[PDB]
Symmetry: D7
């Protein structure tokens, strides 16, 4: 039972990023959230304003065909408040010539249930950048 709720909230977050829905994304993140990812050049960023730039300059503007597969999700439940999920992410997208391409990333998300709502406190991404290559 309880592992399916961590998959559900993770798929909802990946959908909100894909739509460019920064309002829904802001409800799902902790305000003190930290991140490691390729765009931050090896630094640990904190809060949502680093991410807001990609929403305002890509995700809110973009309307191209994109598809995401979550492969082999492994979930750790750590009492009733706390969870971790690790998965491989495959992205299919059309390039600047309109040709299909595939990208892979490795992703970790750490979730805490605050006031009865699940929120991300940390995430780590490796492999392909979130800004897709052309």
């Amino acid at each position: 039972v309880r592992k399916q709720e961590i998959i559900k909230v993770t798929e909802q977050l990946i959908e909100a990023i894909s739509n460019g829905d920064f309002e829904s994304y802001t409800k799902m993140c902790d305000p003190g959230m930290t991140a490691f990812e390729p765009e931050a050049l090896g630094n640990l960023v904190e809060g949502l304003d680093f991410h807001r730039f990609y929403f305002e300059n890509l995700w809110s503007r973009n309307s191209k065909p994109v598809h995401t597969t979550i492969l082999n999700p492994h979930i750790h439940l750590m009492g009733d408040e706390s969870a971790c999920i690790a998965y491989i992410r495959i992205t299919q997208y059309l390039d600047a010539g309109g040709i299909p391409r595939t990208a892979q990333s490795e992703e970790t998300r750490v979730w805490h249930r605050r006031d009865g709502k699940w929120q991300i406190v940390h995430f780590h991404r490796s492999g392909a950048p979130s800004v897709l290559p052309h």
Copy 2:
């Protein structure tokens, strides 16, 4: 107070890996532990036998000078059972010519307190491989 215990157990684990102490490392890991790192080629590994190969073929054999700095540790406490730590790791080492070199990695470790003992349930590494370049 409680954030210092997560720093302590993380430094003890980094020391056990550096010494090649697979017995102490086995006490600090959960048997169901998962990992993402450069040596696994983008796959999620599970359990300790993938790591045992680097202990038996490098860390247990090695006696060269190496130094580690943990930069900017950020810690999330998620109730009394559960914690996450994220940091930048700098490694100083001598190359095959005896010349000093520096490497950087980005690291996340997820800790759960099981039967009163802290253990790693998941980790994620990016940047430099653990097998240092020459």
Copy 3:
């Protein structure tokens, strides 16, 4: 006799992919079907939605001249329910300049007769990508 039916259903499937007929392709695949191929970046995919992207963005749209040769089909029959076919596939196609090109792949398909109908349960491709190079 029975080896010719495995050749027949394999040629019908290659024709449905070539036409972009995702409805006919969906009748010939098991819903739990797995695949290895160049577009999946070394991962094992499951179900039909990874493939649906190439139907919707290429095969359903495409009208260029293409020809396929099946070379040296070897067939194993494993009782009355189960079969395997292995072959070399040659594809002739026109490039973006309108010049003829040739590509080669190596293909395995595993068939099970469910409710009296043959369906693919697994496939593996090597060599040329299915998205043809220009």
Copy 4:
């Protein structure tokens, strides 16, 4: 229950190849077995004499440290006689300088139970060659 027997016989075969035990390997293969793999240059080979060359010139001679991980095995059972297994294979080995390296392959094996004994009738490999790179 029955999926564990396909994992067992697959691990026993990978062990016999790793030991250079061509006698045990010959008991586990069908005499009419076919294969696709990187060493055959894109051709379909048949019978055991192509493989005998790597046993006699490497596997029977070799004594270096090597470790294998089978990741995410997916199994199809197709009546009581017939089975297919698909997995990712990770190999850890020491290079010519004595440094640890990792390789990945994608593997399919098709099994038939003949006279009460499981035997391979076909296999397909992609990614890293079986002769490990240095």
Copy 5:
């Protein structure tokens, strides 16, 4: 005397290919004819449908200036039914800029007299592709 008839029928076939006359080419080939050539990627093709693609997409459409020289034809007569011819082929053609170019191939053709008519049963080409380079 009899060697001149093998030269005659060989020059008539090279003319029919050059004109894009697939009807005349089909009269001169055996329906079971095999071939080795650069376009088949190192495979042995059988029958006429692999060749039909180059007639329909180039030879039937093309009207550029092209000239062919047969150099040093050597002929073996093997009773009254059977003959082999081996020669060097030089092709002069205009490139995409309208500049003259030269290409060389090495060619073997095996002829059998069936029902009083000479037909090709096998051919082998090396050197320049039949689709001329630009």
Copy 6:
């Protein structure tokens, strides 16, 4: 029946070349035999003295492990006197470091039965040189 004799005499010839047995090779060739192959630089050679150089400087001297596979032999019988065989040839050999390698060639041989004995009148090779690469 009669196709097996063309396979037999072809395997005996490949064995005589592999042993460096120029006496047995001279019995199997016509004295007027012609050839196309990579070592002749695109020229048609005639008689046995071009080949004698590789017997005297390699095949008669060599004792390294080598294995040959004949893949997919296609045979044309052209009355009772005359035959043609076409096949793919795979060669496994050890390099100068003692590492296994694989090479591929495409081969045609034309046979005539003179005084009741089969002899080669022409041959054509493509792909890998007969002098194996290191």
Copy 7:
């Protein structure tokens, strides 16, 4: 308390440069200010006229989207008159194709409180040039 005023005046200066406000920048700099940065080719520049060129030819003209993050500011207070700040600077900007990019620099600023107003007496920059790459 007092470290927050050094962060405030540093963020105000970074804002004035980003706006192209050379009048506000001139109020915040000492007239005898020195600098090390990538644009000065390894030389120590003095006064404001070297910087005036980038205001007049870029910052006063530019209206593209740009965002700045100050990471890990460390501050030394050296009596009541004098302060030093060191930080990592991340810049997000759109390239000439309109694609998001990230740059990193390392920055030191030395502040003196003259007539009750904080002013920069020296600065040093490393990493990315201030003129952003495209």
Copy 8:
């Protein structure tokens, strides 16, 4: 007068580093000292243990000929407690072949007079690494 004391203590520190005198270097640094330099990979380091590695593995061991020139020192005095110095540094050294080479760096040092003794609170280096290139 007072600018000459900042030159004096800066030359004494450069001499202590050149000798490998970590005891004298430890007297001249603040225990909370921060640094930016090429060996730290773009990170801000704090305290003396990162630097101790180059003393123990190079400067304490080294006895080769080296010469240093300080070019164009500019000094800011900021009350009686606090000073900043900026200069270009030229290093002459013999390479691994015994040939003279030259390197350049740009350096800033921030000094505070604590308990009547001048100590470094921050430093920033650019250009050549401190570990000299060969």
Copy 9:
């Protein structure tokens, strides 16, 4: 005296080729004439139809400025019927941009006086192709 007639007829032939006068060129060549030159790819051509292609596709069409110098002609007279001439040829021409270029070739021509008229029986060219480079 007699050496000047071999120079005369050689200059007349070079003029006829330069004009694209295939009728005059056909009067000066023997019908059985052989040639070695760069366009024939290392083969010996015979008769005039290989050369006719360059007359019909370049020399008859071309009207650009071209100049030829014959340097150091050496002549052998071999009785009253037979002569050989060897010379260096310099060609000045305008490229596709209208810029002057120079090319060099080495040329041999063998002349026989048949029915009182001098005709070329063989020629050999080296260096620059006759189709000038751009």
Copy 10:
């Protein structure tokens, strides 16, 4: 009949060069003989002293295995005194590692019968240098 004498004297000359027999070579050349070949850098040489250097520094010293094939000799007879021969030359030789190699050249020789003896008055070579590549 008479064409066989031009082949004979040409094979005798190629043998004398291969042996390093400069005395026999001097009997077969005219003292006024001219040559074009790769070693003369595009110049026309005259007399025997340019060639004497390769006899004295290679051909007289050399004892390695070498074999020569004359392919497709074409001969022009020009009265009773004068002849020309043109052929392709294939050379088989062992390299510095002892591995067989092949080279090709194109050759013309002009012969005059002086005092009843055939002598070379001119020669022209193209393709491979006479000093064989390693």
Copy 11:
């Protein structure tokens, strides 16, 4: 006092070159003036006509934004008639895309006071050419 007059006349000359004022430049140069600079290809030029070409083809025509900094001028006074000045020159300019660039040169000027007027008798430039790179 007297060093400021050498700075003044040097800045006036750099201004006259920047304006393309060849009349003012001619008043400031000796008619026998010599120069070393990158445009003269390592030669010593004499008089003003080599320089006149850059005035007439660039400096008199140019109207782009350019800025010059003189860094660290060192002056030698050698009696009342004679002076030398040495400095580093930084040039800021816009490229062909309108992007700011920086160049560095090293400059020496030798001045003599003739009839009460300072004039250049020699100059030497190194580093960046005077014709700025794009």
Copy 12:
């Protein structure tokens, strides 16, 4: 005195070439004049028709700005009839983009006074081609 006349006639000749005045150039050259220069590909040319091509296709057509400097002329007088001059030549010219460029050549001219008029009998050029590079 007499050395100035050799400079005068040399400058007049360089002017006539620069103007494209082939009539004046023809008065200043001996009809038997020889030359070495980069355009002749290492050959010695004789007479004026090789040079006429550059007059007719460049110098007579050209109107771009060009300037020539003669550096360090050394003159040998060899009785009253004969002189030699050697100098370095610098050419300033505008490229195809309108940017100033510089070229260098080394030049020798040999003069003979025939019927009271100085004429060139030989010249030699090295370095830059006379056809200026773009």
Copy 13:
């Protein structure tokens, strides 16, 4: 007369550097002497201690054959106290293999007669480094 004394003292200085005679070099330099040269990386050095390193590590140790030519010395005399000399310098030397090499530099030296003795106050070098290349 007076120009020969500037040549004399310049040749004596070049000799003292070539011998490694730092005592004689110190007598000929002003203690406040400045320099521009390739070894100083584009900086202006002052005094003799930068140069002392090349005396102590090369010139005092070296005994290889070296020869220097001064080409085209131009001298300006600026009253009775002051002189400037400009020349091209050619250096011939043996490389690490013992092969002759040539290098070129452009040099300026400024001389002042202090207390009746000529001394260098400034020098500038371009082209080849003083540390000769191998």
Copy 14:
């Protein structure tokens, strides 16, 4: 008659250089002789001391096999005192591996008969350096 004496004295000089006979070379040169050649880097040298370095470090020491051909000497006689010779020079030599090589240069020599003896007043060389390449 008189042209043969210029060939004689030119061959004697080439022999004296080849022997390393600097005494004989000094008798044949004018003391004021000038030269252009590849070793002088595009400068005009004067007198014999530049050349003395190659005699003392190569020609006097060397004993390897070398051969020289003078091709196509053209001679101008300019009264009874003065002559010019121009020729192509071919050099055959053994490389560092003992393999024959060929080099080409273009050479001009200007001769004056002083006190009844011919002496070189100027020479110019192009193409291959005199120090032969390996």
